Design a protein around this ligand. Structure first.
Ligand SMILES: OC[C@H]1O[C@@H]2O[C@H]3[C@H](O)[C@@H](O)[C@@H](O[C@H]4[C@H](O)[C@@H](O)[C@@H](O[C@H]5[C@H](O)[C@@H](O)[C@@H](O[C@H]6[C@H](O)[C@@H](O)[C@@H](O[C@H]7[C@H](O)[C@@H](O)[C@@H](O[C@H]8[C@H](O)[C@@H](O)[C@@H](O[C@H]1[C@H](O)[C@H]2O)O[C@@H]8CO)O[C@@H]7CO)O[C@@H]6CO)O[C@@H]5CO)O[C@@H]4CO)O[C@@H]3CO
Ligand SMILES: [Zn+2]
Length: 106
């Protein structure tokens, strides 16, 4: 994925080897204090009231743009799909892959 044009948060890429779920995320540097979480459905596509979460952390700047990189990695029992949540300055933004969410393979 290329840098987003206006979205506040947008997955860049993700990886899954059947045990470890990891990835890189584009985050618009709106304010200093940020919270970026990855919310997923389990091997049984159960969301658990948005309770299966992975906290992402600052990874590094992106020269010449108003975005920066955040990464995440975690072992998960199983996963069917996921979306990203971004909280900053009292507002909440999301990356739900045009409301289809990101579907994971195997
Ligand atoms: O005393 C320092 C500081 O202490 C407290 O802040 C803590 C905070 O409460 C915790 O949440 C945590 O902060 C984490 C943060 O929430 C995460 O989002 C992430 O932050 C990364 C950013 O996402 C990323 O963008 C980058 O940050 C760069 C900024 O975007 C860029 O603007 C610039 O920052 C400058 C500030 O804009 C400017 O105001 C000035 O900052 C000073 C503050 O004004 C002053 O209040 C104080 O800050 C307190 C804070 O209020 C407490 O709550 O001192 C600041 C001086 O350092 O100057 C900044 C220039 O340095 O540049 C930064 C890059 O440096 O990277 C960050 C970090 O990777 O992760 C955060 C850390 O986990 O922890 C902090 C304490 O470390
Ligand atoms: Zn990309």
């Amino acid at each position: 994925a290329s840098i987003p044009s206006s979205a506040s948060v947008q997955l860049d890429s993700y990886n899954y080897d059947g045990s470890t779920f990891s990835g890189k995320i584009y985050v618009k540097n709106i304010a200093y204090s940020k919270k970026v979480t990855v919310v997923y459905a389990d091997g049984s596509d159960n969301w658990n009231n948005n309770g299966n979460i992975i906290a992402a952390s600052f990874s590094g700047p992106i020269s010449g743009s108003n975005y920066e990189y955040w990464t995440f990695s975690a072992s998960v029992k199983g996963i069917k799909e996921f979306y990203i949540k971004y909280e900053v300055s009292g507002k909440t933004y999301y990356d739900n892959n045009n409301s289809a969410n990101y579907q994971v393979s195997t």
